Design an enzyme around this catalytic site. Structure first.
Site, PDB file in Angstrom:
ATOM      1  N   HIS A 160     -98.111 -60.405  -0.041  1.00  0.00           N
ATOM      2  CA  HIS A 160     -96.711 -60.163  -0.377  1.00  0.00           C
ATOM      3  C   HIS A 160     -96.092 -58.953   0.312  1.00  0.00           C
ATOM      4  CE1 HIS A 160     -96.045 -62.680  -4.297  1.00  0.00           C
ATOM      5  NE2 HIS A 160     -96.409 -63.414  -3.263  1.00  0.00           N
TER       6      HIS A 160
ATOM      7  N   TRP B  76     -85.307 -66.602  -3.719  1.00  0.00           N
ATOM      8  CA  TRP B  76     -85.281 -66.183  -5.112  1.00  0.00           C
ATOM      9  C   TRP B  76     -84.098 -66.827  -5.826  1.00  0.00           C
ATOM     10  CZ3 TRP B  76     -85.698 -62.109  -1.357  1.00  0.00           C
ATOM     11  CH2 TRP B  76     -86.988 -61.600  -1.209  1.00  0.00           C
TER      12      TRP B  76
ATOM     13  N   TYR C  14     -87.602 -54.803  -6.502  1.00  0.00           N
ATOM     14  CA  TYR C  14     -88.086 -54.314  -5.213  1.00  0.00           C
ATOM     15  C   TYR C  14     -87.230 -53.211  -4.599  1.00  0.00           C
ATOM     16  CZ  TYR C  14     -91.011 -58.525  -5.191  1.00  0.00           C
ATOM     17  OH  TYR C  14     -91.922 -59.510  -5.485  1.00  0.00           O
TER      18      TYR C  14
ATOM     19  N   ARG D 235     -92.808 -59.906   2.267  1.00  0.00           N
ATOM     20  CA  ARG D 235     -91.619 -60.225   1.481  1.00  0.00           C
ATOM     21  C   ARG D 235     -90.953 -58.971   0.919  1.00  0.00           C
ATOM     22  NH1 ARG D 235     -90.682 -65.219  -0.471  1.00  0.00           N
ATOM     23  NH2 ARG D 235     -90.427 -64.672  -2.677  1.00  0.00           N
TER      24      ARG D 235
ATOM     25  N   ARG E 223     -94.550 -67.771   2.105  1.00  0.00           N
ATOM     26  CA  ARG E 223     -95.813 -67.424   1.473  1.00  0.00           C
ATOM     27  C   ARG E 223     -96.969 -67.924   2.332  1.00  0.00           C
ATOM     28  NH1 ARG E 223     -92.544 -69.759  -2.375  1.00  0.00           N
ATOM     29  NH2 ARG E 223     -91.734 -68.317  -3.956  1.00  0.00           N
TER      30      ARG E 223
END
Lengths: 322, 322, 322, 322
Positions: free
Chosen positions: B270, B296, B305, B273, B154
């Site tokens: 994001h 995760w 996703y 990712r 992040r």
DNA sequence: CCGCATAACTTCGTATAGCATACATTATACGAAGTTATCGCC
DNA sequence: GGCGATAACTTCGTATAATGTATGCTATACGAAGTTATGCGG
DNA sequence: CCGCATAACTTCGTATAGCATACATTATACGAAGTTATCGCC
DNA sequence: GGCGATAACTTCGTATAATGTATGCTATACGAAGTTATGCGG
């Protein structure tokens, strides 16, 4: 006491918080209860357990099914609980009489029925007959049956698919986003795919009916006596009308139904769920994939679906017949 | 009640028990609740369920998203609980209201949005379009995008990398040590290795910027109008500035945003990712080996996703197509 | 007051309901708390919330791990709860200070450690080395390691196997009946099966030691300085001794232990559980089979095992670098 | 108290709410409890936690199984609940001693048993031995064994079959309608089919006896000392007499039963269900078909019958024995 | 016949990791308003 | 010699998506002080 | 040019399935007294 | 042509394995009686 009427006013003020169907039968059973109480000179609202016992036995003597009596008790429980009073079902007299009725009726041989299946060889036969159709109505009907068999959706959900929810993968296959269901309520929702077969049917329907003109149109619309389709963005084709597609198709294949007065003599809205689940379990798919296909949370629900597999072709007969 | 005064003094005494991003939000909620109470002459501090009803209906009529309304109710619960008073969400009225709100807004068709992917073909394009620049700002940005896509960190974690934390293994690959972990059990591990190709970009940056003169320097820094870097051991680029790198890089290749005012019109923090996860799932990588790479733990977001990839069509499509 | 004496007397009278480790740790915590209260001239039993606040801040200045402080609070909570008094953790003054200590120590970079793995290649190396030894001590140790790697049991359960518990399939594999575990306790229970190679090691040990001629002996036992076994039905190897087997086997290959004084410098009893789990994850076994093999109830535990993997061989480097 | 007298009177008014097998056990438990209370001179009906504790520890010294002890506690809790009193299981001390008894008795090595399996090889042997016989009592026994093995019906529901439940398909197989189901939602379905081979047996029995002369007659009946069959419609062959068929046919091959006094030294009514389950599992029939065939809703029982087959060896065996 | 001393375990205490079930914090997205260290004219 | 203009970034507030921590017990890690049998040179 | 017809779909009312979570009731096993329809030996 | 010895079950009691129902709400099944646009005699 005032708090009872206050709680009832609060429960009515947010009437939208319950399902549309939950209110209908609270009123339906309240009519019957109040009518019986009046006919027997008993005070109707604050139910007295020894009167409820008599009412339940009277319902048994009329010959209603056990799940009907379960409904009749369940709504009186709901009404008292939401009023903030003790339930009627807390007293031993009604608690034991409900068991007594269940035991005696099950010993007399009552059982729960199940919808007539609709399996792949039927879908293949219907498609084989209808594939040449150039009527708008046949295009609509065949596309609906395709989506129903492929997705295992409920009829109530298929009635509310907006055009904006239809989307495409990287290849040709279609994807439908469903949102809320009978149990799920979230804006993330569930998304389901369609095979390279049925997307030709859906895309033919959209191309011929012209519903694509506004993203707020529904996919399914009235087709009038003239054959014109009437697109709409504010009215939903009724479930009572969707059942007629199944009935008319079954009559087309097998001819007219008889007047025996029994349920499930022809295909109905649940038939495709049962038939798909049977076909998939008989082919030997694993439990987790069946669960992900149907979307259930508890594995034992699968055992409610596959109940009536044909014993005359099951494992043990093949095993002993060597 | 001076006991509430005690509980508040003993709350803000330990204010470091909560993130600054929590405190930022609690005050913003209280300003709105106090302003509405002032306007409507309600007594603002000890909340009354008949006030919370009206306030939640006002927020619905203003059109805020469902999860914004849940945030607003959550902070009021937190304030009451830490004050020692009964929790407002426990009342019968407000739970009925919240059920009505969510069922209405979901029937209106609200849908959750998701970040725009940044994918391998884009990294190849921006690289082959930019790698020849001598302009130091371009070297800095091209190095940042490489570290972001290769490590799935992040942006708030990338902003903190000290040059002390870099090491260089015998095979020549860079190893980045994770200084501060997100969680006491670091499900993401402790060290991450860069590709050989990315290492050349980071070595280009470190050699040009001179930032290696002191181990305490931060790896990334501002570049003035003059085109000269300004190393620092005491200040970091704002995450707001890092989002500008993604925006400027998108604007460099495409046009500009629409006037539609919607979110996620361009790449964002994001985007890496999501794009890396989709690339891994398009290759053969197993679900747990994906899940361990990004850190995760729930399946749900990893599914969310990849749902539209044509690997995920499931058992019924497999049966139908053959 | 004195009803507390009755409650504690009941708790002590039936204390065999609890594991002895739970009492052993409780008494050490009470010794610590009482010694501190005596040093600072405070009453010790009823935990006044500000006293436990001072005690927790005193413990933090000794530099103990976060898990240690959680344990120190958890036992004082359990001692109050079972006595029938309000918990000290019910105050905001205590739970906020715990939340502060947790969040502050993570900013110093503290993280939970994990044991050193023992993977397949080490097992093959040890078998290649030791297979030809005639010392029954080596036969025992190689059988123990083979079981521990195959079955993923805790060493406290491997110490518990009776000769009654061993059975064979018609294929000649061996089955071990587990019975009680750290979480499952029932007279039906788990049964686990060895591969052929490990059965050959176990049967070799049984034949050499003679333990099996009386069914109630334990499977594993001490061997004297002379190299002779001593079967018993009333005593079993300490877990300390089984840890010694791992440490000695490590020192056999890598020669000597480092002087640094860190924990997990060499293999320990947990090392085999971690290793097999990693080998399964790299092999691409599905989550339901990993869950069944380990016997874990919830998928999160899988992610709790594969925390550490070699990033320098991981999927992202392997993908970006072709 | 009058409330107790009324509640007991209501419990007697509706006595058919429970099976006769529940009443039998409730009376045996009450005789045991009242006798112990008389001997120890305590008041017996308003039971107290200290007395239940002492009684449970007395039952443990007789060496009764833990499930027998839980049965004894269960019936006393039913009696208290339906009398309208608070119940012993809610008390503190009883919950601790139930842990103590369970854990101590499991560590003592108490083990659950199963029926001795009656598999295909045994049925082929018994058939090859008996089928030449001509005396009616032998034909009866062989027909019973064939029906029991092919259908997996339990012996009690086998005793209920009236001859009008038999019917024939145009394939020449014989169908049996279930009549009274075990449960309102019959997981086993509604009809069972026999193989041709077993049908050849049943046709012989039903033609040598007179049973077919009235559709109301039961399919099985007494055979007297001289071989005369005694058909009936009011009375049905006792389950105790059905167990004698399994025991006598076992004794005919393996000779006199051992004297050790254990259970399950010979075949019993469950031997067929276990045998047919393992026979299907060897053939690789998937779990959903086996569960639907036998009517199990919980997978744990099917698992507990098949663990011993090496087909159920886990993934670690595949990894080791690659 | 003897005393000694090495093996290979047992007991004890203070630190730290693991599990299964129940429900709240923690971070990023975006537009607008402020810096303050260099390009430029004149 | 200045006043001015302006990149590249910092700080603020409201809106929305993502990931977490508390309970109540069960284990393992390490080293230091002990115990009971044989091997060895007398 | 008007009126009458009939496909194709809406409302309305009693009757029965489906679901997800939490917690007990129902059946088989097997010694061992007790019953009654017949052979067996006169 | 009377008495007693034997199957071949039936009824009873206590010990241990296996499968079930209650709760709160949401949905489908079917007959019947309106609705409302087009088709078409003349």
């Amino acid at each position: 006491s005032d708090e009872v009427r206050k709680n009832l006013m609060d429960m009515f003020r947010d009437r939208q918080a319950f399902s549309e169907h939950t209110w209908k039968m609270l009123l339906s059973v309240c009519r019957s209860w109040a009518a019986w109480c009046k006919l027997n000179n008993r005070k109707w609202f604050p139910a007295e357990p020894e009167d409820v016992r008599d009412y339940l036995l009277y319902l048994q003597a009329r010959g209603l099914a056990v799940k009907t009596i379960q409904q009749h008790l369940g709504q009186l429980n709901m009404l008292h609980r939401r009023s903030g009073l003790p339930r009627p079902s807390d007293s031993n007299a009604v608690s034991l009489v409900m068991r007594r009725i269940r035991k005696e009726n099950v010993d007399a041989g009552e059982r729960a029925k199940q919808a007539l299946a609709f399996e792949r060889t039927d879908f293949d036969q219907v498609r084989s007959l209808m594939e040449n159709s150039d009527r708008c109505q046949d295009i609509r009907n065949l596309a609906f049956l395709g989506i129903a068999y492929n997705t295992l959706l409920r009829i109530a959900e298929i009635a509310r698919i907006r055009v904006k929810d239809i989307s495409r993968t990287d290849g040709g296959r279609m994807l439908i986003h469903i949102g809320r269901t009978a149990t799920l309520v979230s804006t993330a929702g569930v998304e389901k795919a369609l095979s390279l077969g049925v997307t030709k049917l859906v895309e033919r329907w959209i191309s011929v009916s012209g519903v694509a003109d506004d993203p707020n149109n529904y996919l399914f619309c009235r087709v009038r006596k003239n054959g014109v389709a009437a697109p709409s963005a504010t009215s939903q084709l009724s479930t009572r009308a969707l059942e007629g597609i199944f009935e008319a198709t079954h009559r087309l294949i097998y001819g007219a139904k008889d007047d025996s007065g029994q349920r499930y003599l022809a295909w109905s809205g649940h038939s495709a769920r049962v038939g798909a689940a049977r076909d998939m379990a008989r082919a030997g798919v694993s439990i987790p994939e069946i669960m992900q296909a149907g979307g259930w949370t508890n594995v034992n629900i699968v055992m409610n679906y596959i109940r009536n597999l044909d014993s005359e072709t099951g494992a043990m007969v093949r095993l002993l017949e060597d």
